[PDB]
Design a protein around this ligand. Structure first.
Ligand SMILES: N[C@@H](Cc1c[nH]c2ccccc12)C(=O)O
Ligand SMILES: N[C@@H](Cc1c[nH]c2ccccc12)C(=O)O
Ligand SMILES: N[C@@H](Cc1c[nH]c2ccccc12)C(=O)O
Ligand SMILES: N[C@@H](Cc1c[nH]c2ccccc12)C(=O)O
Ligand SMILES: N[C@@H](Cc1c[nH]c2ccccc12)C(=O)O
Ligand SMILES: N[C@@H](Cc1c[nH]c2ccccc12)C(=O)O
Ligand SMILES: N[C@@H](Cc1c[nH]c2ccccc12)C(=O)O
Ligand SMILES: N[C@@H](Cc1c[nH]c2ccccc12)C(=O)O
Ligand SMILES: N[C@@H](Cc1c[nH]c2ccccc12)C(=O)O
Ligand SMILES: N[C@@H](Cc1c[nH]c2ccccc12)C(=O)O
Ligand SMILES: N[C@@H](Cc1c[nH]c2ccccc12)C(=O)O
Ligand SMILES: N[C@@H](Cc1c[nH]c2ccccc12)C(=O)O
Lengths: 69, 68, 69, 70, 69, 69, 69, 67, 68, 69, 69
């Protein structure tokens, strides 16, 4: 299954997993401090990921940067 | 399944999931504020995605921008 | 399954689903206003899509533009 | 899933015709397009060949081709 | 399955379906007039396709042109 | 399944299908006259194809040309 | 046949953390790398996201990324 | 399944099919005269192909010529 | 399944297999002397590989070098 | 499965098939004379192939040449 | 499965198969003299291959060369 790379460019970046299925809510929030890298798959439980905070993001479609709050 | 990357370029962008199946209605609207990124798949429940508001969007077919 | 990206270049664009199966009819018309984007799959229920109105469209085969009357 | 064709009508009354899959061949559906309208259509359980009549711009996995009307 | 694109470059082009199976014969002859485009798959019933008449043909292997007479 | 494109460069080109299975014999010869095009698959019944006569041939491995005597 | 990440520690004490697959998300394992060591780790039935903490050079299918201490 | 293209550059080229399985023998030899093309798959019955005689051959790996 | 190529650039390189499953520990350490090459898959038993010592490594993602 | 192309550059080249399974022995040696070409698959019975003698070899990984004793 | 090409650049090269499974031991050592080429798969019985001696090696990842003691 696909995965997303997220590198925190500041402290407190929040990588939020949203529930697969008929209902949509977050099920997990993973906090990243500056410089930490999370490599996360889509899964049986996670069908959408949201990033809040300043982060450098790689996906199969190229690079994208989130900008915090 | 494929996924779409949506970066909100203003506050209040809405990423709306349309229901898979014989009926078509909005089942969920994810609101993004300026700068937030959402990476969303097509799924058993979502067969079409609508973006309303200013956003930078990446799919397998390239980049496209919605305008509010 | 494949998908189409449609960006409305004017108000009142219609993205119309045609029914899969021995019967062919419109089962849904999604109305888009200027600047809105719709990313739509082929599915069990939809085996052809028709765009009416001015829109920028991306498929696996590249870009194409529909023009309104 | 299956391949699809993009058809952009370059004049009014373009006619996209779906031919029956199976041992017999006849049209089962005719979808008329006005100028500027786009139809994106798959091959399916019911449609194993597609004919285009009228002036249109067509994209497939093999590239671009243009039909020209009678 | 794969498919062939055939554009008739004169009237009365024949796109002919040969039967899949232990026996080989024509099961259908589609007649195309000048300018008409046919996009045709290999199928359960059709394992070979013959083009007679002047036509521009695209397959996965590139372009080829039939010539009538 | 793969397919071969064959364009007859003279009259009476023969595209011959050889039987899939423990035995190897000709099961069908398709005659092409100059300018006709045959697009033929490998199948449940056909596991090798022989061309005799002058013809332009395209496969996944590129172009080749048969020559008659 | 899953995807994998390559992690080369650029300083002592780098942590490569596996997060559990499923409805529950927690760290299940932390592999400590010292400077110069390389770990090549797959996504698995038990690991659906990987966090890197500490200075490291990382390779995925999406290209290179660096974690910062 | 993959296939090989063989164009005979002289008369009497032999394309030979070797048996798949625990045993290896020739089950079929197809004779090609000059200019004839044979496009042949690997199969349930044929797991190796031998070309004897001068021929132009194309595979997924490129061109090669027998002598 | 993917595989890694490891060429020992000094004696005593260790290519270590980590156990697939809920639990994680090293189950094997293959020792390589200078100039030897090991080509190793991921497998039912091995879901992560650690290289310790100076080595030239090739994967589907390109080259990387471990250092002593 | 994949296959290897072997062209003998001298007489008496040997293409040897090693047995798939817990045991490893030669089960078949195909002798090639100069100029002959053998296109051989990996199979249920053959999991490794050894070439002895001067030959030009093509695989999916490129060209290699074996050199006679 | 993937395979490795090994060309011995000196006499006495050893291509060693390591056992697939919870235990890891050498099950077979194929000895190659100078110029011989071995093309070997990963298999049900072999999940890791070791090359000892001077040899030119091709894999899907490119060329690598082993150097003898
Ligand atoms: N629960 C929703 C989550 C989701 C995925 N993609 C989306 C796109 C838009 C809105 C919601 C979603 C689903 O699995 O379908
Ligand atoms: N319920 C529809 C939603 C949809 C997907 N793609 C479409 C294209 C046009 C109209 C509606 C749709 C379906 O699953 O088929
Ligand atoms: N109901 C038709 C719809 C359709 C798909 N592609 C077409 C092409 C031409 C005409 C109709 C169609 C079917 O599923 O086959
Ligand atoms: N009924 C025919 C339609 C068709 C598909 N491709 C063709 C090519 C030639 C002629 C007819 C066909 C079939 O399903 O086989
Ligand atoms: N009935 C034959 C038709 C055919 C397909 N490919 C061919 C090549 C040569 C001759 C005939 C054929 C078959 O299905 O096998
Ligand atoms: N009956 C043979 C036909 C064949 C296919 N490829 C070949 C190569 C050589 C000789 C014969 C063949 C088979 O199905 O296996
Ligand atoms: N337990 C979560 C772990 C996870 C994977 N990707 C994520 C993205 C965001 C948050 C959590 C996750 C799951 O398997 O789905
Ligand atoms: N009967 C042998 C034929 C064979 C295929 N590839 C080979 C390579 C070497 C020697 C023999 C073979 C097999 O199916 O395995
Ligand atoms: N036992 C773990 C080993 C592992 C694989 N990838 C990892 C990433 C991080 C930590 C541990 C691992 C597993 O199979 O899931
Ligand atoms: N019988 C061994 C043959 C083999 C394949 N690849 C190898 C690599 C090294 C040594 C032996 C082999 C196997 O099937 O596993
Ligand atoms: N018996 C081990 C062999 C192995 C494959 N890859 C490895 C990497 C490291 C150590 C051992 C291995 C296995 O099948 O898993
Ligand atoms: N010999 C090893 C690995 C092993 C072999 N057979 C096993 C069966 C089950 C668990 C582990 C093993 C050990 O005892 O750990």
């Amino acid at each position: 299954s696909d995965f997303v790379v997220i590198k925190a460019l500041e402290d407190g970046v929040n990588v939020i997993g949203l529930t697969r299925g008929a209902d949509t809510r977050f099920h997990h929030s993973e906090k990243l401090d500056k410089g930490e890298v999370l490599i996360a798959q889509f899964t049986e439980h996670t069908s959408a990921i949201k990033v809040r905070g300043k982060a450098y993001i790689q996906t199969r479609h190229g690079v994208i940067e989130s900008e915090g709050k």
